[PDB]
Amino acid sequence: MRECISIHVGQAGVQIGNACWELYCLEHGIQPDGQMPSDKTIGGGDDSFNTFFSETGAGKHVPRAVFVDLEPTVIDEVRTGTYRQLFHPEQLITGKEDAANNYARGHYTIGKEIIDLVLDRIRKLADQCTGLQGFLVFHSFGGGTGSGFTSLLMERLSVDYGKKSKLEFSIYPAPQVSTAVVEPYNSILTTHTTLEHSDCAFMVDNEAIYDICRRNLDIERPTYTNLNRLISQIVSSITASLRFDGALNVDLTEFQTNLVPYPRIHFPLATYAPVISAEKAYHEQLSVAEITNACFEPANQMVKCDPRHGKYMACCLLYRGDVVPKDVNAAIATIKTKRSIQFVDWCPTGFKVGINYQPPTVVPGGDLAKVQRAVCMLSNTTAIAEAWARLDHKFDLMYAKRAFVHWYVGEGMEEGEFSEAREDMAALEKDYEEVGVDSV
């Protein structure tokens, strides 16, 4: 009984959470009604694992998830959908006054009326814990909730709990594509506030996943269900060692160590190679020598930043299925002998490994195929600086004419804070430059 607590903030968070708990439910057999025909069928079992789920004497397994938001258009789909008899009715919807895509509303004005309830709910889900391990936020840069509420929440949780992991997932803004013209402000501000309180922040980018879904699965008209299912498989792969039996198990405290060298450079990138439909499920062997060489391809990442424009700095590879630990070592070795994948002269290892025996599930009427083995790689590399610089440039083009600043000011934000966030984020680019200069 060691427990992790999921928190979902915003439309994107709630959608990724729905896609994630669908996967968990189809994995353990735990159903929408909270009842599991696995403990009361064979004569015993612990299939619904109590790390992400809970238990009630009536067989109802209520999950550990708040599903926070500030607009009832999203949570009411859960409350009036299939997974209504599963969650706790304390979903912490406000019903009122969406943030309108600014950081100041969801950090000062409307957020402060709602955060104490969320903290009380987290405390109530953490007092029946006999020692938890960490949190998992699902926020989206390019909004008011994902940018401000996550900042306030990781700021309050760095005061009460303190010595606990506070990992997060983040929809990195695409450079060209974007569904908002006020997102760079919120992005730099959240990277100013969610820096000294968080530990690791796994980034994704809807453009790269569009491209890979087009190239591999052959979908020309994808919608966010298929995107969130990939992200659900990723968050399952990074949360399986607690939830299933394995050989070389990874805990949540081991991401802060092998991946966050400096306390500010903790912005890695996810990748999940065996993305193949049922048609291409055949004609491929799908061994580790193919997978791990596909996960490092530039055209299979989840962020739109070429790894070849920078040196790799750390990598955590987490496998699932029939993996014999000789193909993994051979794959890492033949990946090390390549001249494109370039490592820095203070991390020769850079190849953390993790194995698990439970294969991945499959959603009916889905998009992916039944593959006996899966892989998920999380890379901390120095290319991200370029992407950050792009956003930084946007911040310098729009702030130099005080555009949109009345809206942030109207919710109490103090322009000096914007300049401070800019100067703070520039030093991080300078740090990414420092960590490429090889030793003398």
Binding site: Q15, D76, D98, A180, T223, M398
Partner: protein, 429 residues
């Protein structure tokens, strides 16, 4: 929940309001008597955005009419959708303004704005939350312009933190809907630029051309023009009344479209418009909409966007669709026609989506655009204003009803300063 308070100031506002109610009801399933008669459930869930409950599952609308003359109220009462309104919200008078702003902002309107604000208070305080108002008025008159501007002023003095969106009609360039237009229009712009958060500009000539060119209508009544205007008024609130993948309330559009406060005057548009015969030859996919929305013909603003640069654009879609298509299409539209956009806004497009489409179209949309091409509409008004003010062509009727000559120069200076504010960015730096 979010709740809009409709107001209908003048004849045009009343007609558009009736058509919009006759549009939103058939969308939510309400009948003329007030009862629910539907097929789905997502209608009654967010019905409080526009409606209230009376007693027996009856649904009355949150409309608050105002009109100095008595005819339009009786036309809206005796019409088809007239038995559903609240009769105590009819707040009219007699002895209309007479195409005089002075007789609709100081003398006659001063006697009835109190009653209209009483109804506004009664209907607003009932609400749990409040997202803003939604007025419809027509420059070129005294009831609409005067009374609506005074009401906006008094509301923004009372309820400031909300949005006083209004779907104003502007005067056409060539034909004159009324002789003394520039006085009233310039004064209304003086009383709107500083007392609003968003505003929409509709013009009759653009809608005539849309009716004749795309829809292939040779005799379009006012009802068709209005039926071409309630469309976007629905599309704006579609992401509040219905669910979707990417939601966008009015405040989100306001934050993303108004980079500087005064520059909130926009150009609206609808997507799938076609003749009753040429519908079986067209493909109901997304790029056909996206090229039917950016064209300089669908825009009701009577100002070609090609003569300026889109500072901002916003697109509210409604249907089962793929977001890759929408995002990539907006990206390639920005890349192709880069000269018609700006460079210091890197991404100059906002997207927003619903999932419950319209009554008969599998795929609908709505477009809003802040461009520098709308400075022409005010340049024209100011030129007419100078031509008619340099020797005081029709001014003595405005002074006698309590006004002076300095307010006119104030409004002229403000309108010209706004034109200059747009022209500062019309030119590539």
């Amino acid at each position: 929940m979010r709740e809009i308070v409709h107001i209908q100031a003048g004849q045009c506002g009343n007609q558009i309001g009736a058509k919009f109610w006759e549009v939103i009801s058939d969308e939510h399933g309400i009948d003329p008597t007030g009862s629910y008669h539907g097929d789905s459930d997502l209608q009654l869930e967010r019905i409080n955005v526009y409606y209230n409950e009376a007693t027996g599952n009856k649904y009355v609308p949150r409309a608050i009419l105002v009109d100095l003359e008595p005819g339009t109220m009786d036309s809206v009462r005796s019409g088809p959708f007239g038995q559903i309104f609240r009769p105590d919200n009819f707040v009219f008078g007699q002895s209309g303004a007479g195409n005089n702003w002075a007789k609709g902002h100081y003398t006659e309107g001063a006697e009835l704005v109190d009653s209209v604000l009483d109804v506004v208070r009664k209907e607003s305080e009932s609400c749990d939350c409040l997202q803003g108002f939604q007025l419809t008025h027509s420059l070129g008159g005294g009831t609409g312009s005067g009374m609506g501007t005074l009401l906006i002023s008094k509301i923004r003095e009372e309820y400031p933190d909300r949005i006083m969106n209004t779907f104003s009609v502007m005067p056409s360039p060539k034909v004159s809907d009324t002789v003394v237009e520039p006085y009233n229009a310039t004064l209304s712009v003086h009383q709107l630029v500083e007392n609003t958060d968003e505003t929409y500009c509709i013009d009759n000539e653009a809608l005539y051309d849309i009716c004749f060119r795309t829809l292939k209508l040779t005799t379009p009544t006012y009802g068709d023009l209005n039926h071409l205007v309630s469309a976007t008024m629905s599309g704006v609130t579609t992401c509040l009344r219905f669910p979707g993948q990417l939601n966008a309330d009015l405040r989100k559009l306001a934050v993303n479209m108004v980079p500087f406060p005064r520059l909130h005057f926009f150009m609206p548009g609808f997507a799938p418009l076609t003749s009753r015969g040429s519908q079986q030859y067209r493909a109901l996919t997304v790029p056909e909409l996206t090229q039917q929305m950016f064209d300089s013909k669908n825009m009701m603003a009577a100002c070609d966007p090609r003569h300026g640069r889109y500072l901002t654009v916003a697109a509210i879609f409604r249907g089962r669709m793929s977001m890759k298509e929408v995002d990539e299409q907006m990206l390639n539209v920005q890349n192709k026609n880069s000269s018609y956009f700006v460079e210091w806004i890197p991404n100059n497009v906002k997207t927003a989506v619903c999932d419950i489409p319209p009554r008969g179209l599998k795929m609908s949309a709505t477009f809003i655009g802040n461009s520098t091409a709308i400075q022409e509409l005010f340049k024209r008004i100011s030129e007419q204003f100078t031509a008619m003010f340099r020797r005081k062509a029709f001014l003595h009727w405005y002074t006698g009803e309590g006004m002076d000559e300095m307010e006119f120069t104030e409004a002229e200076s403000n309108m010209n300063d706004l034109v200059s504010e747009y022209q500062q960015y019309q030119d590539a730096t």
